[PDB]
RNA sequence: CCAGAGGGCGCCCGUGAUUUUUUACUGUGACUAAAAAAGUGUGACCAAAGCAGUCAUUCGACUUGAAUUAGAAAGCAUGGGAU
RNA sequence: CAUCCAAAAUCGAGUAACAAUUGGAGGACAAGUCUGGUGCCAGCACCCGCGGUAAUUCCAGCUCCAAAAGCGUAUAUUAAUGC
RNA sequence: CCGGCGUCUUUUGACGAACAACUGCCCUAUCAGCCAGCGAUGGCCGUGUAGUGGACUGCCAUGGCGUUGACGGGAGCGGGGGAUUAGGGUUCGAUUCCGGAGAGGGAGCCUGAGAAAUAGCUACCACUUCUACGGAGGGCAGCAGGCGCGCAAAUUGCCCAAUGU
């Protein structure tokens, strides 16, 4: 089976992006997968997306503008902290300039940049370039 | 039974050095605990400088020229903790030890009639034989016949001119209060609230003047007065307010340009 | 802690379970303290129930605890 | 010497402790004192507190108390009827706490008759008072059953309380 | 026993000492500035690496962090002193543009020569060690004494000097 | 591969503890059979009493004769071979003279063109043998 | 030296819950020997170092300085409520 | 250690004999198109390899190189190791 | 007439002593079962101790621990900390400070507030020194120093001036 929802979604996006395809299908939907997409659509990396309803589990559909290069998943959801933002941001990303790690917090779902700003660490979620 | 102490294992609030000597004095047991006290010899020698050597401190004290609590002492080693008045009548000076801001022993200089005042925190109350009530203090003093309103952790104003206890002061409500130990030493503020955790340490939250709240243990509360304009005793060099690291460094430079 | 067994007269067996952390692998492990307690004849909790236990003076060789309450 | 320690004993896992330390004088048993009947003999020992404790040997007298009326008088210890711990003890008439015993009973009798100015005090005390039946029968004869509620082996004084109905009825039936 | 005085190394040898690239850039210094041996070139390297480590670590941090604030001003302050950097510098990237020569340049040996009080660096190393130089009024007979930006304009000569 | 679970820890630990026994760079440290085997006891040097001078051949690609010394060890009563590592200093070693013995280079493999010998003779009678070779000191027979 | 009115906090105890409620994680705060390390000040001639000293100018001044940070788990308090 | 060679009065370098050494120069690895001696011998060589009379590696001299009042050698341990 | 010392007993702060527990700790399964006659786990009543307690006697019950590695074996005084590493880590800790233990090997004991003390005592064992041989002693892992040992490590010096007791 699949033991991470995110992993199932963002291996469709990455593959599709490397083939230059301008839409992708996503088999499941979660409250979580939504939030992840939302982020990247603000910062300009996605055109739009639709959630469709089968009344069992939804099928997300996304429009890629080709502005992504990867969307990963950090699977164990390891604990990152106020000092350790530095660590992750160096090690898994090609840059500090345009690398975006996305984290979970009690507050919501947000970029590392906004995480530091509000001074709360948390468990990591995923990342994109 | 320990009868030796090494300089490193001794407090560095006595401000000994790593080099020069190997031992430090272990004082005779008395009112105050080993960590919170400062031994006579340390004071006279390293601070006041009426002695340049150990032997010179014996010369002064054994003879007697020095009083604490207004009693003359022939003791070479004796504790001096907190709220103790020491008087050398030869100089004619009256020191009152306290906790200075930044964890330092303060030596503060007082008018002569203030040096008959003293403040002792109560630890336990209990009834002893004959139904005679007793407040036992943090300096080990026994106050016979305390007021019926006395409670644990309150202060008793204590006349050293002749021994008795005038009106008390409670730890109740917001009152001007200062900290003992815990590395918030000498910092003064109002009690904002007193938290309770039964079966465990009772947190209290203090708020010093110009805001900046903080938390310290109930055990480390020592009352001063009713209000900051009703204080019975003097404050050390700084008023009980700490400042940021940046501002320390800034001011150090500004004065060094003179 | 829970109830591991109800065996013995006025003595129960409690099992605490917690998590230790290892830095190198960045991953937790499960480790349990199997402990003995003196259960008051007031209470008699079933296996799997959760118990609360306090700190009392020694009462046997192994027993240091006592049962305050039961859930 | 004799010691009180968990470090010559098996663990809960069935394993064995291993030593690295020679035994302290802090931990320290001593041989049991044997209090019996006969002439009083008291041999002190010095203890760790800087004070003495007294080894009762052969105490034949005790300070006994009657429950409910808040009194007491001395009387003579005659016999031991019973004990929880062993039968062996009882036969040698050793005195150790929570042995049932037998006493002279004479002063209690004397007292209870005192329980013109005097005379009306009696009538007031007779009123709103009663006594168990099994008590009074024995107290008439001049023997009684009591318990020794002080440990005589470390004080060299044997004090006891006198049995009253609830508990008396139990020890009686065990005989 | 009972010694509580520290020891530390101030100099270390770079890895792979037979690099012909490194050899060039060693001799170039040690001959020019009149240095005794390579040990000196390394001594400054260490202390520079040290400084550059904390500066890197500070630079990483978000704005308005206590480490950044306090310790940033200090690093900058002490490069204003000794004249390594000027007072138009503040970034903590300027600090990372410091290299080995700018240190050596402010050693007493070179400063003496450059101020016009000797005819060579070799000659100025003698002038130091023959006890005939000063750094304001204080006789200094160490060539590795780093000279303040203020006090390189008050060098003069010793008052023990037959040349002064 | 590996396990990425949160509570996966103990499986990881036990895996490493197994697979380090397939390393010989683990065994060489932790195991005391290695220590025992080494003729010095794992000490830096040892002394021995010279027994006999033994002429030793050489391997096929480089034909030479090599001068070696059969020595006995005071410490453990083991015998060993060692090489004389200077030109024409076989003289300066004589029978029943105390002598020191060292390892040479790689100490798990024998040196080229001398099989079985990892051992070179540094000092004869605590005198530096190099010192005798390139003359400074003279050998005592005192 | 206010009858009545609802009261409003503080304190202690008693009673009531259809099923009270916790923990990891995180932010902040408590509580925690020195030596050692990171670090602030300072021309021990520099330097490893040290916690000293420095200034007028005398029959002392600086309210002289001797900052500050980190220091595994585990335990403590209190916010947050996504996973 | 420091301060000094008179304050009236007190020493002293020119081969500056007050004279720097320990390991290297085929490759790895900074430095010999050298000269004599030896000739698969003697020996060198961590490893690759040198020596059978034509030796850039041996045994000597000169020359140059690296570090320097320190420099080689042995063993263990750490980095090198994502072996 | 007053002052300064000194002491009995009682009282409780301090300086410490003695117990207990929450959490953590190298390798090994070609060490998987361990524990109860003579205490293993618990209950009940006593005994003992300064005190709690299977610490111990008597009686009664049949439990306790284990692949989340018990039990056994090997290596090792523990920690603060050292070395090395960009990071993660890797490795060391006999040794100045703190804690524990020991004084040739073992056991027993007195005195004292505190000791199972060892430049205190008693005994045995392994050594070892004197004796007109009837007896009497010795314990450096305190400082120097000597012998032995091994690759390997200082003067039978001066001083209580300093730092402490």
Tell me the three state secondary structure of residue A34.
helix
Rounded CA–C1' distance between B1 and I17, in angstroms: 8
Dist CA B71 CA B68 (whole Å): 6
Whether the CB-CB separation of F13 and C22 falls below 8 Å is answered with yes
**Which of A20, A48, A68 finishes a domain?**
A68
Q: How crowded is residue C15: how many other Cβ atoms within 10 Å of its Cβ?
A: 13
Place of tokens 């020491």: B86
Dist CA B18 CA B8 (whole Å): 7
Give A76's contacts in chain F (Cβ within 8 Å): 4-6
Dist CA C19 CA F10 (whole Å): 12
Give F4's contacts in chain A (Cβ within 8 Å): 75-76
Closest C-alpha to D103, from D66, D156, D130: D66
Beta bridge partners of B117: B159
For residue D13, report the phi and psi dihedrals to the nearest 5 degrees.
Answer: -95, -5
Closest C-alpha to A15, from A78, A82, A84, A62: A62
Place of tokens 């004799």: D2
Nucleotide nearest to F64 (CA to C1'): H40
Tokens standing for B178?
Answer: 């200062």
Q: Do chains D and F touch (3 or more CB pairs under 8 A)?
A: no
Tokens standing for B140?
Answer: 């080990």
Sequence-distant (6+) residues with CB within 8 A of C9 are none
Rounded CA–C1' distance between F117 and I147, in angstroms: 37
Residues 96-155 of D with CB under 7 A from strand I: 96-98, 151-154
Number of independent structural domains in chain B:
3
CA B143 to chain centre: 19
For residue D12, report the phi and psi dihedrals to the nearest 5 degrees.
Answer: -75, -15
Whether the CB-CB separation of B77 and B40 falls below 8 Å is answered with yes
Contact between chains at B246 and E2 (C-beta distance less than 8 A): no
Rounded CA–C1' distance between F134 and H79, in angstroms: 37
Is A64 in the same domain as A2?
yes
Tokens standing for E144?
Answer: 């590795």
End-to-end CA distance of chain A: 28
Is B51 in the same domain as B159?
no
Nucleotide nearest to E160 (CA to C1'): H4
Nucleotide nearest to D56 (CA to C1'): I47
Is A120 in the same domain as A94?
yes
User: How many alpha carbons lie under 13 Å from residue B55 in its C-beta half-sphere?
Assistant: 0
Q: How far is D51 from chain C (nearest CA, A)?
A: 26
Q: By residue range, what is the domain housing residue A37?
A: 1-68
Exposure letters D78-100 (e unless 16+ CB within 10 A, then b): bebbbbeeeeebbeebbbbeebb
Dist CA E151 CA B257 (whole Å): 16
Domain boundaries, chain E: 17-164
Which residue, among B246, B250, B252, would best test binding to E if mutated, counting the most E CBs under 10 Å from its CB? B246
Give C61's contacts in chain D (Cβ within 8 Å): 6
Q: What is the CA radius of gyration of chain E?
A: 18
Give F5's contacts in chain A (Cβ within 8 Å): 76
Dist CA D96 CA D149 (whole Å): 9
Tell me the three state secondary structure of residue A31.
helix
What residues of chain F have any CB closer than 8 angstroms to a CB in chain C?
5-10, 12-13
What DSSP assignment string belongs to chain D? -----STTSB-TTS-B----SPPPSSS---PPP---SSS-EEEEEE-TTSSEEEEEES--EEEEEETTTTEEEEEEEEEEEEESS-HHHHHHT---SSEEEEE--HHHHHHHT---HHHHHHHHHHTT----HHHHHHHHHT-EEEEE-S-TTTTS--EEEE--HHHHHHHHHT-
Whether B258 is in a domain gets the answer no
* CA angle D91–D97–D99, rounded 5-degree value: 40
Whether B84 is in a domain gets the answer yes
Closest C-alpha to D170, from D149, D145, D136: D145
Closest C-alpha to B124, from B107, B142, B112, B111: B142
Is A10 in the same domain as A64?
yes
For chain B, give the number of residues.
258
Q: A92: part of which helix (H) or strand (E)?
A: none
Give C27's contacts in chain F (Cβ within 8 Å): 5-9, 12
Q: By residue range, what is the domain housing residue B107?
A: 1-113
Rounded CA–C1' distance between F87 and H36, in angstroms: 20
Q: Which of residues 158-197 of B touch E (CB under 8 A)?
A: none
Three-state secondary structure string covering chain B: CCCCEECCCCCCCCCCCCCCCCEECCCCCCCCCCCCCEEHHHHHHHHHCCCCCHHHHHHHHHHCCCEECCEECCCCCCEECCCCEEEECCCCEEEEEEECCCCCEEEEECCCCCCCEEEEEEEEEEEEHHHEEEEEECCCCEEECCCCCCCCCCEEEEECCCCEEEEEECCCCCCEEEECCCCCCCCEEEEEEECCCCCCCCEEEEECCCCCEEEEEHHHEEECCCCCCCCCCCCCCCCCCCCCHHHHHHHHHHHHCC
F21 in contact with nucleic chain I (CB within 7 A): yes
Residues 28-57 of F with CB under 7 A from strand H: 28-29, 42-45
Which chain C residue's Cα is nearest to F2?
Answer: C25
Closest C-alpha to F114, from F79, F68, F50, F76: F68
Dist CA B162 CA B156 (whole Å): 15
What residues of chain A have any CB closer than 8 angstroms to a CB in chain F?
75-76
What DSSP assignment string belongs to D44-68? EEE-TTSSEEEEEES--EEEEEETT
Q: How crowded is residue B115: how many other Cβ atoms within 10 Å of its Cβ?
A: 20
What CATH number has the domain bearing residue B151?
A: 2.40.50.740
Q: Which nucleotides of H are covered by protein (CB under 7 A)?
A: 3-4, 23, 29-31, 40-52, 58-60, 65-69, 73-78, 81, 83
Give A75's contacts in chain F (Cβ within 8 Å): 4
Residues 112-151 of E with CB under 7 A from strand H: 139
Which chain D residue's Cα is nearest to C60?
Answer: D6
Dist CA F132 CA F124 (whole Å): 10
Place of tokens 């059979």: F33
Whether B254 is in a domain gets the answer no
Nucleotide nearest to E135 (CA to C1'): G45
User: How many alpha carbons lie under 13 Å from residue F111 in its C-beta half-sphere?
Assistant: 14
Residues 32-71 of E with CB under 7 A from strand H: 36-39
Is A85 in the same domain as A112?
yes
F6 reaches A (C-beta below 8 A): yes
Whether the CB-CB separation of D104 and D76 falls below 8 Å is answered with yes
Tell me the three state secondary structure of residue C3.
strand
Which residue, among C24, C25, C30, would best test binding to F if mutated, counting the most F CBs under 10 Å from its CB? C25
Sequence-distant (6+) residues with CB within 8 A of B111 are B94
Contact between chains at F10 and C29 (C-beta distance less than 8 A): yes
Nucleotide nearest to F58 (CA to C1'): H40
What CATH number has the domain bearing residue A106?
A: 3.30.1490.10
Rounded CA–C1' distance between D88 and I91, in angstroms: 67
Residues 31-90 of F with CB under 7 A from strand I: 32, 43-47, 74-75
Chains that touch F (3 or more CB pairs under 8 A): A, C
Is A58 in the same domain as A107?
no
Experimental method: cryo-EM
For residue D162, report the phi and psi dihedrals to the nearest 5 degrees.
Answer: -95, 140
Instruction: Indicate the pairing of strand D61-66 with strand D159-162.
Output: parallel
Sequence-distant (6+) residues with CB within 8 A of A111 are A39, A100, A101, A102, A103
What DSSP assignment string belongs to chain F? -----TTTHHHHHHHHHHHGGG-HHHHHHH-SHHHHHSTTTT-S-EEEEEEEEEEE---TTS---EEEEEEEETTT--EEEEE--STT-STT--TT-EEEEEE-S-SSSPPTTSTT--EE--EETTEEHHHHHTTSS-----
Beta carbon pairs, C and F, within 8 Å: 19
Contact between chains at E66 and B19 (C-beta distance less than 8 A): no
Domain boundaries, chain D: 30-175
Tokens standing for D62?
Answer: 């005790």
For residues F94, F95, F98 and F104, what is the CA-based torsion angle, rounded to 10 degrees?
70
């Amino acid at each position: 089976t699949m033991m991470s929802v995110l992993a199932n979604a963002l291996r469709c996006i990455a593959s599709a992006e490397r083939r230059g395809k301008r839409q992708v299908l996503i088999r499941p939907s979660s409250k979580v997968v939504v939030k992840f997409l939302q982020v990247m659509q603000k910062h300009g990396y996605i055109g739009e997306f639709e959630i469709i309803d089968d009344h069992r589990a939804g099928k997300i559909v996304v429009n890629l503008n080709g502005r992504l290069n990867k969307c990963g998943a950090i699977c164990p959801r390891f604990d990152c902290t106020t000092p350790d933002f530095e660590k992750w941001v160096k090690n898994i990303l090609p840059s500090r300039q345009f690398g975006f790690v996305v984290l979970t917090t009690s507050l919501g779902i947000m970029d590392h940049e906004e995480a530091r700003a509000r001074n709360t660490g948390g468990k990591v979620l995923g990342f994109f370039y | 039974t320990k009868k030796h102490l090494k300089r490193l294992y001794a407090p560095k609030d006595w401000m000994l050095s790593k080099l020069t000597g190997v031992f430090a004095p272990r004082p005779r047991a008395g009112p105050h605990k080993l960590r919170e006290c400062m031994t006579l010899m340390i004071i006279i020698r390293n601070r006041l400088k009426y002695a340049l050597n150990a032997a010179e401190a014996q010369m002064i004290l054994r003879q007697g020229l020095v009083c604490v609590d207004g009693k003359p002492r022939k003791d070479t080693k004796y504790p001096v903790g907190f709220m103790d008045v020491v008087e050398i009548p030869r100089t004619g000076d009256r020191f009152r030890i306290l906790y200075d801001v930044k964890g330092r022993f303060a030596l503060v200089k007082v008018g002569e009639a203030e040096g008959n005042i003293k403040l002792l925190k109560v630890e336990n109350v209990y009834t002893s034989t004959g139904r005679i009530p007793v407040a036992m203090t943090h300096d080990g003093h026994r106050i016979r016949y305390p007021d019926p309103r006395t409670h644990r952790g309150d202060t008793l104003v204590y006349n050293l001119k002749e021994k008795k206890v005038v009106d008390l002061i409670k730890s109740s409500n917001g009152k001007v209060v200062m900290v003992t130990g815990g590395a918030n030493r000498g910092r003064i503020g109002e009690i904002m609230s007193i938290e309770r955790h039964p079966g465990a340490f009772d947190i209290a939250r203090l708020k010093d003047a110009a805001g900046h709240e903080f938390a310290t243990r109930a055990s480390n509360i020592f009352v001063i007065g009713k209000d900051m304009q009703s204080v019975p005793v003097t404050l050390p060099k700084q008023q009980g307010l700490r400042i940021n690291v940046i501002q320390e460094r800034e001011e150090k430079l500004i004065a060094a340009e003179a | 802690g829970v109830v591991h067994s109800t065996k013995m007269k006025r003595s129960i067996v409690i099992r605490r379970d917690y998590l230790h952390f290892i830095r190198k692998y960045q991953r937790y492990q499960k480790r349990h303290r199997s402990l003995t307690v003196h259960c008051s004849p007031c209470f008699d909790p079933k296996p799997g129930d959760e118990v609360i236990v306090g700190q009392c003076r020694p009462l046997s060789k192994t027993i240091r605890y006592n049962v305050l309450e039961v859930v | 010497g004799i010691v009180r320690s968990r470090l010559h004993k098996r663990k809960i896992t069935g394993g064995k402790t291993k030593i690295h330390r020679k035994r302290m004088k802090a931990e320290l048993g001593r041989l049991p004192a044997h209090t019996k009947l006969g002439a009083r003999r008291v041999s002190p020992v010095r203890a760790r507190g800087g004070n003495f404790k007294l080894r009762g040997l052969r105490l034949d007298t005790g300070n006994f108390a009657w429950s409910t009326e808040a009194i007491a008088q001395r009387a003579r210890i005659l016999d031991v009827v019973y004990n929880a711990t062993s039968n062996e003890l009882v036969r040698t008439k050793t005195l150790v706490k929570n042995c049932i015993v037998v006493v002279d009973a004479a002063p209690f009798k004397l007292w209870y008759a005192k329980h013109d100015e005097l005379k009306r005090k009696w009538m007031l005390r007779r009123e709103n008072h009663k006594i168990e039946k099994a008590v009074a029968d024995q107290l008439k004869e001049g023997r009684l059953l009591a318990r020794i509620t002080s440990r005589p082996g470390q004080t060299a004084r044997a004090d006891g309380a006198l049995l009253e109905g609830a508990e008396l009825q139990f020890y009686l039936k065990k005989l | 026993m009972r010694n509580y005085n520290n020891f530390n190394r101030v100099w270390k040898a770079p890895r792979r000492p037979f690099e012909k690239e490194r050899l060039d850039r060693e001799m170039k210094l040690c001959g020019q500035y009149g240095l005794r041996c390579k040990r000196e070139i390394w001594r400054v390297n260490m202390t520079l690496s040290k400084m550059r480590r904390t500066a890197r670590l500070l630079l990483t941090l978000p704005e308005n962090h206590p480490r950044r604030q306090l310790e940033g001003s200090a690093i900058m302050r002490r490069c204003h002193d000794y004249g390594f950097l000027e007072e138009e510098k503040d970034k903590l990237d300027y600090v990372l543009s410091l290299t080995v020569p700018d240190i050596l340049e402010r050693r007493l040996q070179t400063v003496v020569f450059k101020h016009g009080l000797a005819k060579s660096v070799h000659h100025a190393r003698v002038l130091i060690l023959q006890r005939h130089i000063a750094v304001a009024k204080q006789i200094v007979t160490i060539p590795s004494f780093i000279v303040r930006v203020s006090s390189e304009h008050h060098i003069a000569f010793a008052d023990a000097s037959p040349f002064g | 591969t590996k396990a990425n679970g949160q509570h996966a820890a103990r499986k990881l630990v036990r895996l490493r503890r197994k697979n380090r026994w397939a390393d010989k760079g683990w065994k060489k440290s932790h195991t005391f059979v290695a220590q025992k085997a080494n003729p010095f006891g794992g000490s830096s040097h040892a002394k021995g009493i010279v027994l006999e001078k033994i002429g030793v051949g050489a391997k096929q690609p480089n034909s030479a004769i090599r001068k070696c010394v059969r020595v006995q060890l005071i410490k453990n009563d083991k015998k060993i071979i060692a090489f004389v590592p200077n030109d024409g200093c076989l003289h300066f070693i004589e029978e029943n003279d105390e002598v020191l013995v060292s390892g040479f280079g790689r100490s798990g493999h024998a040196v080229g063109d001398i099989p079985g010998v990892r051992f070179k003779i540094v000092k004869v009678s605590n005198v530096g043998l190099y010192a005798l070779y390139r003359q400074k000191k003279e050998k005592p027979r005192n």
